[PDB]
Write a protein that binds this ligand. Structure first.
Ligand SMILES: O=C1O[C@H](c2cccc(O)c2)C(c2ccc(Br)cc2)=C1O
Ligand SMILES: O=C1O[C@H](c2cccc(O)c2)C(c2ccc(Br)cc2)=C1O
Lengths: 257, 228
């Protein structure tokens, strides 16, 4: 049986899972059900070429649409972060820094829930845009999404569920090694609890899965490379597409990342 | 299983001690006596000439790490191409990991610890050289705060080598199988050696994220020429 210390972690796991469900309208559970045909009511329209894209309704237009759903996810992530115990008690400046650096890493984590090896759910699951079609977009927009797919397919082999992911994206937000943090110790103390709660969660939920905890934390290096690679591509786009406007919310996040 | 994990941890420590002349235990006592380089004048008595010497020492380290890799149980039984890929893509990560052992926030040991070059001097070198080592110092500061010792680093290092995500690997299965074993051994080791540092295993794994960022940044910024 468990002790009282484990007991507080289960309650923390429960609270975070609960807030996750309340902040993200499209869970992995819903996304996998749509992707695998648990559907007849949840079947998505598939976008795989020019006419199907138009029927669902070029490269810049898709990009602008990705950006603004991405801004929407910033709001959801920020809403979730407020529910992480201790986060809103932290110094305000550090709240911003943690969101600044953590938000994209979470966006790509959750994006993975929306993907299989052949495409990505869009518009809260009503559409599905193939990976082949995204890669066919004119340079360099065709290169935007492939590294997320390569990651998603490796990350999705961990077979995490929403109860696991809830704590994992909390651990991401609460990183003490973020640049420019005023007070690192309170951040680390919260992540230590989160790391304990994730570890027990993975042992109970995936008891046959050896060292899943460690393999999940190692995926954090993938996320950083995705973000670091996406920032580079964005810098190229701005220079060659001088007439393409980026969101100031995202502007402020990339600024000196 | 725990008996196995200790055997592996001891085996790796033994090998690490054999393979690496300047251990963390030694470097730290030295850092607390070496010839100090702080000045153009002081370097003389001790920018391109310094980068090349770092290149020399790194080639030296690549050989120590190679020898150490081959003591890792199962490593030599991997596909020969996979052994080459793992070392190729892993040595940069190991070198900066172990360079942290020779670093404090003020400088880095050099030449078996015979010398000490200061962070401030290295920062003063003309572009792009002055900005080569600053991100390694930032990294070593946060890494050394974990207070790992040589018995901890020997398993951590082996973990880095057995990374199943290096590009071009042919048989990823035994690599992840071995690393899984190493990860267990590291987790147990950090619990016994640091029973008071909560979640030190997790925090150490997270440091791989900074490590790889550092290596990529260093790559971008980057008969005699044949050797290097
Ligand atoms: O491949 C895509 O990446 C976009 C994306 C990236 C990151 C997060 C997200 O929610 C969507 C995205 C997307 C999502 C919705 C809309 Br409308 C347009 C593009 C893709 O099709
Ligand atoms: O033996 C070494 O040669 C390098 C070196 C140091 C000082 C002057 C020099 O010409 C070469 C050098 C070195 C240079 C940069 C960094 Br950083 C770490 C070591 C050694 O350890």
């Amino acid at each position: 049986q468990l002790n009282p210390e484990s007991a507080d972690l289960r309650a923390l796991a429960k609270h975070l899972y609960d807030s996750y469900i309340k902040s993200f309208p499209l869970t992995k559970a819903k996304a996998r059900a749509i992707l695998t045909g648990k559907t007849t009511d949840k079947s998505p329209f598939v976008i795989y070429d020019m006419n199907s894209l138009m029927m669902g309704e070029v490269a810049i237009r898709i990009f602008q649409g990705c950006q603004f759903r991405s801004v929407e996810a910033v709001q959801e992530i920020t809403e979730y972060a407020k529910s992480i115990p201790g986060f809103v008690n932290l110094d305000l400046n550090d709240q911003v820094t943690l969101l600044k650096y953590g938000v994209h890493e979470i966006i790509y984590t959750m994006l993975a829930s929306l993907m299989n090896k052949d495409g990505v759910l869009i518009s809260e699951g009503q559409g599905f845009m193939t990976r082949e079609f995204l890669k066919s977009l004119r340079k360099p927009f065709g290169d935007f999404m492939e590294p997320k797919f390569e990651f998603a397919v490796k990350f999705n082999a961990l077979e995490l569920d929403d109860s696991d992911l809830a704590i994992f994206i909390a651990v991401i937000i609460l990183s003490g090694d973020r640049p420019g943090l005023l007070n690192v110790k309170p951040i680390e103390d919260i992540q230590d609890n989160l790391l304990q709660a994730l570890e027990l969660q993975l042992k109970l939920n995936h008891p046959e899965s050896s060292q899943l905890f460690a393999k999940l934390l190692q995926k954090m290096t993938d996320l950083r490379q995705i973000v670091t690679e996406h920032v580079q591509l964005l810098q190229v786009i701005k220079k060659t597409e001088t007439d393409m406007s980026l969101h100031p919310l995202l502007q402020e996040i990339y600024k000196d990342l």
